[PDB]
Amino acid sequence: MAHHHHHHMGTLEAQTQGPGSPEGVPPTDRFPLLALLRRTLTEEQVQEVVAKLTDPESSAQIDGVVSKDEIEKFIADVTKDEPTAQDISRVASRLAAGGWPLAGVDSTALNA
Numbered sequence: 001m002a003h004h005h006h007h008h009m010g011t012l013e014a015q016t017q018g019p020g021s022p023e024g025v026p027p028t029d030r031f032p033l034l035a036l037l038r039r040t041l042t043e044e045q046v047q048e049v050v051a052k053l054t055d056p057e058s059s060a061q062i063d064g065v066v067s068k069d070e071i072e073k074f075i076a077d078v079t080k081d082e083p084t085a086q087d088i089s090r091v092a093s094r095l096a097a098g099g100w101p102l103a104g105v106d107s108t109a110l111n112a
Contacts, residue, residue, distance in 0.1 A: 016043070023108035027051070033111075039079050041087055043112050049074045050094040068082035071095075 033044035070096040
């Protein structure tokens with residue numbers, strides 16, 4: 001009820017850059033790209049969501065519980081206001097592919 005759905009209207013494949021060529025970066029919450037806080041979760045903000053999500057201790061007090069719905073909470077927490085299957089899927093893709101220690105993860109593919 002009330003909730004509509006704007007169809008896929010967006011051919012604007014955005015580019016990336018960062019400081020130049022972001023690779024070899026350590027898993028540090030404070031990247032230069034974290035100077036952007038907006039409703040529309042771009043890569044940086046998604047990687048931030050997962051950077052928070054990946055700490056199972058902190059989540060236990062941020063909202064007070066640990067349940068996988070937490071993804072939605074953290075997304076909406078980033079001024080998204082609108083955690084849809086898109087957001088949950090992307091974030092989930094990051095944390096799913098974000099296999100900690102040596103899982104074969106790319107230290108550059110975390111950017112776009």
